[PDB]
From a paper:
The [name] motor of the eukaryotic replicative helicase is loaded as a double hexamer onto DNA by the Origin Recognition Complex ([name]), Cdc6, and [name]. ATP binding supports formation of the [name]-Cdc6-[name]-[name] ([name]) helicase-recruitment complex where [name]-Cdc6 and one [name] hexamer form two juxtaposed rings around duplex DNA. [name] is a ring-shaped helicase containing six related AAA+ ATPase polypeptides featuring bipartite active sites with catalytic residues contributed by neighbouring subunits. Biochemical studies established that ATP hydrolysis by [name], but not [name] or Cdc6, are essential to complete helicase loading.
To further understand the role of ATP hydrolysis in [name]-to-SH transition, we assembled a DH loading reaction using [name]-[name] bearing the Mcm5RA variant. 3D classification identified two distinct states of a complex containing [name]-[name]-[name] but lacking Cdc6 (OC1MMcm5RA). While all [name] subunits are visible, the two states differ in the configuration of [name]. In conformer 1, solved to 3.7 Å resolution both the C-terminal WHD domain of [name] can be observed as well as the ATPase domain (though local resolution of the latter is lower). [name] ATPase is engaged in AAA+ interaction with the neighbouring [name] subunit, with ATP bound at the interface. In turn, for OC1MMcm5RA we observe two states, co-existing after Cdc6 release. In one state, the full [name] subunit is visible, and its ATPase domain is flexible yet still engaged to the neighbouring [name] subunit. Compared to the OCCMMcm2RA, which contains a three-subunit ATPase spiral, the [name] subunit engages [name] in OC1MMcm5RA, capping the N-terminal end of a four-subunit spiral. Nucleotide (ADP, according to the cryo-EM density) can be observed bound to each of the [name]-6-2-5 subunits forming the ATPase spiral, but not to the [name] and [name] subunits. [name] establishes new contacts with DNA downstream of the [name] DNA binding sites and away from [name].
Numbering used by the authors:
A (entry chain 5): 23 to 106, 133 to 193, 204 to 213, 236 to 303, 320 to 335, 349 to 517
B (entry chain 8): 15 to 158, 186 to 207, 220 to 433
C (entry chain 6): 100 to 123, 134 to 200, 260 to 420, 445 to 463, 500 to 509
D (entry chain 2): 183 to 458, 475 to 709, 739 to 864
Write the structure that this text describes.
């Protein structure tokens, strides 16, 4: 029965044609030549090629994805033999993404699509993928591909087998933390975090503060009466309408665009045209440049409002936080260097220390709004000096040291 | 709210299924793109700015004329019926009001016929409303806090569907069509209606349609439709009814108190049952503790006098012994605390007692008071 | 098969029942009051208990209270079945006894191992309190092999599974299913108190102690109050005894450490002309 | 069968669990759902089921009174064994929904029925062991909110010694179930949960705290754990006030039996339905009161009757109590709706006991002392969850006072950092924080009433306000009304004050009895106030809830010229930092004055009184030499 599924995958790889070319076969051959044992399968082509296997994958991928891995491995080995390890499945998709807050007990073991920002990444971990074991009682050997060792020998007492280390294979794995965009979080709520796991070629592709699009499987694992920690098996990470493009180009073509936008910044406030234009410039921001020696010019524009109280200075920041696509608003009094900048904290779910981004790390590529700036402590200001002038944050805590970039 | 558009549904074979489908689920619908609506807007402007009501007309026992009301509000009302047996000689004095009335009627008669054909299964009443046999009431508020009202007609039509509540209606460009009590009554259970809430100071004109009022309410009853309309007007306008129908007003008002005491008994049953099942003992609690919860269930203020009114009708209702604290108590009389069959039996016994006492009161030749007298517990 | 009987306990129960029947019947009026007002705990004045048999009954009850308490509880529940059986009804015979008005009040200073298992009264200033919790007084279990039920499994100071399946046709042991509906629970609270200022001489530090309250007496202790407690001393397991010098006994290996706590049944806080005047001779 | 379930053979659980009784009451429930007597309204439950199937939701709200009226003992069974009744009533509702909309089970597994209008309400401190496993309805304030996590509902196990799969078990959220014998092996061997054949549910845990105005004297606030299941998540957020109906059950089994002495557990409430309102009898009396001519003066005289004089302070207190309109103009712009009041003056001027009236009058009031408060404590505190070990945030005093008022006594003597923590709360009505990776903003929509002493402890009338206090112009700019008090001496004023105070101390001294004592208390209230105080509290709540006066530009000049006059007089004198924020105070206090009449529009008289109050407050704070000139410079107003 599953032989038909394998044959269908083989056809979808070898014989599928798009743009008058065998795009999947050619891309897998190119990956083999590069020696990258991974295949990026597009779900939009899969649904158009065969709907029944798509239904099976969408409803019960539990056996389908082992079939995907083994079929891709076999087909790639056939291609390598024709031209002259287990190949990883990578999924690219553009279907509608379910909100993170809408994930429930009904999407168990179902492949879903998500989007969010990475706030923490763990160190790499080595996991077994192929084992050879020997019985200590009688030296009988066998191979095994959650996995657990056999309780009895196949030829010896309970638990007789031991692992032959020099005849086994292992793979890497990384643990990731995803959360919803704070701009999409209504006030009065802490953004929901989500645990994600990736392995082999999908590791180390993101750092905290990165905004990504996810294709993966919703699942749970045991780590409250029956509060099983949910986690995501990462399958694919990605990181305007034509009429919208025309509308915004006409807006650019407007002979009075600059003044229109200047008035558009806080129209419910009077005057203050100079600071309005300066805030417009801040919203657009500068252009990045790189020196020939490798150093980067900070393109961010930082403006200090230093006037008398009651001059609509707070209202301007609160309005920008609405307007900017990426915006973070926090008070100087209620913040700290460990909160504004990155910090190292231990993850209770995986019992490991994690590098966790701060508020300014979350604002990477955007604008942060800070108020009562004169009232923060000097150490926080020293860290903000680095954040402003070098676009980096230096962390030296416990027994680890690291530097993390922040284009805020 | 369903909307009917004449640009797409104007024929009888088009309107009748749509009207039937609306009335099987709703009691109110909208009319759009009627040709006279543009003229109706100008006529409404003329009435509300130039053609003020004739305040010197006065008001009569027929509930027609210009009735002054509270807050200097005036109500201009006229009634017309094809049957000469009813003396509605007080026809409308203003030509703009008649212009609105005619333009409303021209389509409202057909729509009322459509509604009757849709929901009324009586073949004898399919054409009960027509050009030869119809009765209409023209109503116009005026100002020189919403009021709950329930038209008794087959269909109610408003030239402007704005500021009307049931949720509010804010469709000025559509006319409002509302079904009354008679249409639901003749629907034999296939259609029901609900009362509406409107602003009495919004100067809104309204029209309601009946068959000729000499027609009886039903073949199973002796009173005519005019009797039901008279009852509704007496209930709505006590000041006018006092000069002409005092005893009828009292008789009609006493029923509300009867329903009140019945629902009070219904609430008290649940309250006492929940109090009894929340204790390992049957000791009667003090009344002042029960009173807030009783009032909350009743959704209006309840006092000791209202409780004592129950003892007046059904003496075997509750045990009202007085505690050593001097605080009045109440408890179920049944020894075996409660049984659902006995609960229903006691409710029916109270209902029978209340109905018998109501009949006794209305059968007395003396003028009727509209409230139940309170019982007096023997002082100790 | 007949179990071993405490003849002294039986005599004590009989004397207690006779005291309940003959004392004047104010306590039967209290029972009726509890039935009227749906009350769980009865209260007994200690000086009323100490006026029968020249107080020898009270002395015997007090000096071994943790032993004799079940007999008095049985006597009181037999009396309540005799006169107010409706209190056995639920929606199942939870019942408490609280003695008060002790003649002697003992300090945290004067706590001794000799006082264990005896009725005494203490006083101290409250410093910390914990929130109230339910306590598993009596539990019931259903068998796993068969589906028999075991009722009245008293949980004496520890989680105690039944030691046997009552029907000899079943061999169940060490495995049971806990009932949470037919089982009954009671309120729980711990009070952390401090020795009073007038007790400690200058240059001496105040002693601290933990006091246990259960039932309706809970929440009557407030921080900063000069509260007064009545009950019996009981030892509880301790984990901080490790590392101390000296030889430590062992069981055979198992540990047998202890520390002292006070269990109180009655709670009162020390503090209108006639009310005050009527308490003076 | 019918009416045969009424026989009480034993306790209710012993009777409900019988399959015949269950079938009989299920038939009765089906009859109730299919037909109900609501006269002209028809069978409303049928329409509710139809519209639920239309709306693709699981909430079938059921009025308790309806079922109690129609079926006496059927509701009483739910009143004592709610879980058992709901267990089959869910199936009855499911089949009823599938009658109208077939294949409803294809998308929805179950129907989560919700109870409404349950007539018995208990506080979070009134729960007792006698109410265990019963249905309760409590009211509280959300303080701390956990995340949403999946939890098992029907669990199946795999035996290690055989390939057979054990039967389904329901997760009651009581204990981590662990079977002891396999149905086939009869062995005590290991078992593991078969996840692939297990049905889950959503889980969230929220703490409900006693309302700030309901804490009893001298005790810490009580709170309980409330469990939200079956799509009842995210119904509330910190700072919100909610009432919830649920089941009082015990689930803290485990090491607690040995860690703490003796076997004990802890109680939780599993939520069934939750809700975040005036009878005609109250609105009628409110509208009777509203029509009195000059109602504003009665309201002003009603604030703190036992405090003599200080009318210019009492008016500000009343205006802050009523508040204004939080005009979120076009959404993209916002304005604070509440008035901020500062009471500055010499000792012996009741700057503190006024706050002991706002705390007892407003619906939700929080009181704090300057040196007894911390910046973390007022705004928000960080916590680690005892279950998930995650970083969590708990709101402070300002978050608790959301949609209320926050009181700060001795505002001058608090340290500078705690004073700085109030900056964002005074204008944004929110708390912004970044601690331990938590980045969020909470609602702090509260007014602030502050009392302080001048520099040196006595006000120097010869020196400006900007010199008599240790505060600064920024902090002063966040206020609207500044009330300056001098304890100057005069025989007539002192005689009046003393003869008022001695009679107040005569009144406040001690000396159907309940009714008689309430009558005597209201007599004493009448002796000193024109409005009964309970009625005043209800009136304030009603005005804040219902009345939202709108503005008209009929009197633009009368406000603009006053603003220009104030700015001109502040150009070269040490005085209040008069800015646009102070202009908004006139409008907001005019709105508050209008909201006392319950008028829907801002009239000229309201603006006149507003201008009077603002101009008098500005003038009464200048130095002596300039005060007697500005007395005549603003004689127009
Ligand atoms: N030019 C202006 N137009 C409209 N409103 C203004 C203007 N200037 C100030 N405001 C008012 O001032 C308030 C903002 O003050 P804010 O800047 O928060 O005070 P602070 O400077 O003490 O933080 C807003 O409510 C706004 O209505
Ligand atoms: N205007 C007043 N009328 C009546 N009593 C007053 C007045 N001012 C002060 N008192 C009395 O003096 C006391 C002042 O207390 P407090 O509010 O602490 O003073 P302050 O806060 O002004 O230092 C109150 O108990 C009050 O009874
Ligand atoms: Zn072997
Ligand atoms: Zn057994
Ligand atoms: Zn097995």
């Amino acid at each position: 029965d599953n032989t038909e599924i394998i044959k269908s995958f083989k056809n979808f790889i070898l014989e599928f044609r798009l743009d008058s070319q065998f795009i999947y076969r050619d891309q897998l051959r190119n990956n083999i030549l590069v020696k990258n044992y991974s295949l990026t399968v597009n779900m939009e082509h899969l649904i158009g090629y065969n709907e029944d296997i798509y239904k099976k994958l969408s409803d019960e991928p539990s056996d389908i994805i082992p079939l995907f891995e083994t079929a891709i491995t076999q087909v790639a080995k056939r291609i390598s033999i024709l031209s002259r390890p287990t190949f990883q499945l990578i999924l690219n998709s553009n279907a509608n993404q379910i909100p993170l807050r809408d994930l429930d007990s009904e999407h168990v073991s179902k492949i879903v699509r998500l989007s969010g920002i990475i706030i923490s990444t763990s160190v790499l971990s080595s996991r077994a993928t192929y084992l050879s074991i020997m019985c200590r009682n009688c030296r009988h050997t066998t191979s095994i591909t959650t996995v657990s060792l056999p309780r009895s020998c196949l030829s010896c007492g309970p638990d007789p087998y031991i692992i032959i280390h020099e005849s086994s294979k292992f793979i890497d794995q990384q643990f990731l933390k995803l959360q919803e965009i704070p701009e999409l979080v209504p006030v009065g709520e802490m953004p929901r975090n989500l645990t994600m796991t990736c392995d082999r070629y999908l590791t180390n592709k993101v750092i905290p503060g990165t905004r990504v699009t996810i294709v993966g499987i919703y699942s749970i694992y045991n780590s409250g009466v029956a509060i099983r920690t949910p986690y995501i098996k990462i399958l694919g990470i990605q990181s305007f309408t034509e009429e919208e493009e025309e509308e915004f180009l006409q807006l650019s073509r407007n002979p009075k665009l600059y003044e229109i936008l200047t008035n558009s910044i806080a129209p419910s406030i009077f005057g203050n045209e100079d600071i309005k234009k300066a805030i417009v410039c801040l919203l657009m921001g500068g252009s990045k440049k790189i020196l020939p020696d490798g150093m980067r010019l900070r393109g961010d524009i930082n403006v200090l409002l230093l006037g008398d109280p009651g001059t609509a200075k707070s209202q301007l920041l609160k309005f920008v936080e609405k307007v900017s696509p990426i915006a973070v608003y926090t008070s100087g009094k209620g913040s700290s260097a460990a909160g504004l900048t990155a910090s190292v904290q231990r993850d209770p779910m995986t019992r490991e220390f994690y590098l966790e981004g701060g508020a300014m790390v979350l604002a990477d590529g955007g604008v942060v709004c800070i108020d009562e700036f004169d009232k923060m402590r000097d150490e926080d200001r020293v860290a903000i000096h680095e954040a402003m002038e070098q676009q980096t944050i230096s962390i030296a805590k416990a027994g680890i040291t690291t530097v993390l970039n922040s284009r805020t | 709210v369903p909307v009917i558009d004449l640009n797409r549904v104007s024929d009888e074979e088009q309107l009748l299924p749509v009207v039937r489908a609306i009335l099987l689920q709703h009691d109110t619908f909208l009319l759009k793109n009627y040709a006279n609506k543009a003229v109706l807007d100008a006529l409404l402007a003329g009435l509300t700015t130039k053609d003020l009501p004739d305040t010197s007309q006065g008001f009569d026992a027929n509930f027609t004329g210009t009735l002054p009301l509270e807050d200097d509000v005036w109500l201009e009302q006229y009634i017309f019926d094809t049957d000469p047996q009813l003396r509605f000689d007080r026809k409308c004095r203003n030509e703009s009001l008649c212009s609105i009335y005619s333009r409303l009627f021209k389509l409202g008669l057909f729509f009322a016929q459509l509604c009757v054909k849709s929901v009324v299964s009586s073949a004898e009443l399919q054409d009960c409303i027509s050009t030869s046999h119809y009765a209409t009431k023209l109503t116009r508020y005026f100002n020189d806090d919403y009021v709950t009202f329930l038209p008794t007609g087959v269909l109610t039509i408003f030239p402007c569907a704005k500021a009307i509540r049931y949720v509010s209606i804010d469709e000025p460009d559509c006319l409002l069509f509302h079904t009354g009590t008679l249409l639901a009554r003749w629907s034999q259970g296939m259609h029901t209606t609900s009362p509406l809430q409107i602003d009495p100071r919004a100067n809104i004109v309204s029209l309601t349609i009946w068959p000729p009022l000499t027609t009886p309410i039903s073949s199973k009853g002796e009173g005519t439709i005019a009797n039901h309309l008279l009852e509704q007007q007496i209930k709505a306008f006590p000041k006018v009814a006092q000069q002409y129908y005092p005893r009828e007003l009292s008789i009609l008002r006493l029923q509300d108190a009867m329903k009140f005491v019945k629902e009070l008994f219904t609430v008290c049953e649940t309250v006492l049952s929940l109090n009894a099942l929340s204790r390992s003992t049957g000791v009667p609690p003090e009344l002042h503790v029960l009173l807030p919860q009783i009032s909350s269930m009743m959704k209006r203020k309840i006092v000791q006098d209202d409780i004592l009114k129950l003892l007046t009708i059904w003496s075997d209702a509750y045990v009202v012994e007085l505690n050593s604290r001097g605080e009045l108590t109440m408890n179920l009389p049944k020894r075996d605390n409660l049984t659902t069959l006995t609960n229903k039996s006691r409710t029916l016994a109270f209902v029978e007692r209340a109905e018998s006492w109501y009949q006794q009161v209305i059968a007395s030749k003396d003028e009727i008071m509209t409230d139940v007298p309170a019982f007096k517990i023997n002082k100790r | 098969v007949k179990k071993v009987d405490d003849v002294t306990g039986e005599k004590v129960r009989e004397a207690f029942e006779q005291f309940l029947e003959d004392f004047s019947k104010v306590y039967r009026a209290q029972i009726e009051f509890m039935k009227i007002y749906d009350l769980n705990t009865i209260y007994i004045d200690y000086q009323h208990l100490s006026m029968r048999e020249n107080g020898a009954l009270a002395m015997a009850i007090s000096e071994q209270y943790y032993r004799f308490l079940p007999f008095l509880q049985k006597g009181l529940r037999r009396v309540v079945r005799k006169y107010a059986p409706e209190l056995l009804n639920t929606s199942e015979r939870v019942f408490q006894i609280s003695f008060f008005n002790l003649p002697t009040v003992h300090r945290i200073r004067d706590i001794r191992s000799e006082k264990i298992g005896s009725l005494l009264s203490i006083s101290g200033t409250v410093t910390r309190t914990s929130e109230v919790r339910p306590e598993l007084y009596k539990a019931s279990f259903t068998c796993d092999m068969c589906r028999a039920i075991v009722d009245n499994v008293e949980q004496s100071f520890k989680y105690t599974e039944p030691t046997f399946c009552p029907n000899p046709s079943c061999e169940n042991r060490a495995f049971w299913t806990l009932n949470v509906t037919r089982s009954r629970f009671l309120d729980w609270q711990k009070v952390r108190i401090q020795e009073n200022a007038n007790e400690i001489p200058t240059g001496s530090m105040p002693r601290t102690l933990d006091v246990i309250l259960r039932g309706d007496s809970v929440e009557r202790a407030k921080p900063g109050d000069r509260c007064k407690f009545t009950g019996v001393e009981i030892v509880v397991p301790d984990v901080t005894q490790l590392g101390l010098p000296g030889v430590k006994p062992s069981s055979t290996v198992r540990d047998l450490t202890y520390k002292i706590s006070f269990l109180a049944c009655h709670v009162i806080s020390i503090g209108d002309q006639e009310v005050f005047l009527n308490s003076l001779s | 069968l019918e009416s045969l379930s009424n026989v009480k053979a034993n306790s209710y659980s012993e009777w409900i669990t019988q399959p015949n009784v269950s079938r009989t009451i299920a038939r009765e429930l089906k009859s109730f759902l299919l037909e109900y007597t609501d006269e002209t309204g028809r069978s409303v439950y049928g329409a509710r089921i139809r519209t639920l199937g239309e709306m693709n939701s699981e909430s079938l709200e059921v009025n308790y009174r309806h079922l109690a009226e129609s079926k006496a003992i059927l509701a009483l069974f739910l009143a004592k064994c709610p879980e058992e009744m709901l267990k089959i009533f869910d199936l009855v509702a499911m089949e009823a929904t599938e009658l109208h909309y077939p294949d409803y089970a294809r998308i929805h597994s179950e129907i989560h029925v919700r109870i409404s209008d349950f007539p018995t309400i208990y506080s979070l401190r009134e729960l007792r062991e006698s109410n265990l496993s019963s249905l309760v309805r409590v009211t509280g304030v959300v303080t701390r909110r956990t995340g949403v996590f999946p939890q098992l509902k029907y669990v199946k196990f795999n035996c290690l010694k055989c390939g057979s799969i054990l039967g389904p078990f329901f997760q009651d959220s009581n204990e981590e179930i662990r079977i002891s014998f396999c149905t086939n092996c009869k062995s005590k061997g290991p078992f593991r949960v078969n996840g692939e054949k297990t049905v889950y549910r959503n889980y969230q845990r929220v703490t409900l705290q006693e309302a700030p105005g309901t804490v009893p004297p001298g005790r810490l606030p009580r709170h309980r754990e409330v469990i939200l299941l079956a799509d009842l998540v995210d119904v509330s957020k910190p700072g919100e006030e909610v009432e919830v109906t649920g089941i009082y059950k015990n689930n803290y089994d485990g090491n607690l039996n040995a860690k703490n002495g003796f076997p004990v557990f802890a109680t939780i409430i599993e939520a069934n339905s939750i809700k975040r309102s005036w009878t005609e009898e109250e609105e009628r009396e409110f509208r009777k009161i509203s029509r009195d001519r000059g109602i504003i003066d009665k309201i002003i005289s009603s604030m703190a009757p036992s405090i003599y004089g200080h009318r210019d302070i009492k008016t500000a207190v009343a205006c802050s109590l009523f508040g204004g309109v939080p005009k979120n103009v076009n959404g993209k712009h916002s304005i604070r709706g509440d008035i901020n009041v500062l009471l500055l003056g010499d000792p012996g001027t009741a700057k503190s006991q006024i706050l002991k009236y706002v705390e007892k009058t407003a619906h939700r009031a929080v009181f704090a002392t300057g040196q007894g408060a911390s910046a973390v404590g007022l705004t928000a505190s960080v916590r680690k969850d005892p279950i998930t070990k995650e970083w969590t945030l708990e709101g402070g005093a300002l978050v608790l006072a959301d949609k209320g008022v926050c009181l700060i006594d001795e505002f001058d003597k608090m340290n500078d950092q705690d004073r700085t923590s109030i900056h964002e709360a005074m204008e944004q009505q929110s708390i912004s924080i970044s601690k331990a990776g938590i980045v969020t903003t909470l609602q702090a929509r509260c007014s602030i009433i502050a009392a302080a002493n001048p520099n040196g402890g006595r006000y120097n009338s010869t020196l400006p306000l900007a010199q008599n206090v240790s505060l600064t112009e920024p902090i002063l700019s966040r206020f609207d009304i500044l009330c300056v008090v001098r304890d100057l001496v005069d025989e007539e004023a002192d005689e009046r004050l003393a003869t008022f105070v001695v009679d107040s101390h005569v009144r406040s001294h001690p000396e159907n009895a309940r009714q008689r004592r309430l009558q005597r208390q209201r007599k004493k209230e009448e002796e000193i106030s024109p409005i009964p105080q309970e009625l005043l509290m209800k009136y304030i709540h009603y005005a804040r809830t219902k009345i939202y006066p709108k503005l008209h530009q009929m009197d633009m000049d009368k406000v603009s010229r006053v603003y220009a006059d104030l700015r001109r007089e502040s150009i070269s004198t040490g005085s209040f930092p008069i800015t646009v924020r102070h202009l908004e105070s006139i409008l907001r206090i005019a709105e508050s004055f209008a909201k006392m009449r319950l008028s829907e529009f801002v009239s000229s008289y309201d603006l006149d009184r507003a201008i009077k109050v603002v101009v008098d407050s500005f003038v009464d704070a200048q130095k002596v030499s300039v005060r007697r000139q500005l007395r005549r410079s603003f004689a127009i107003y």
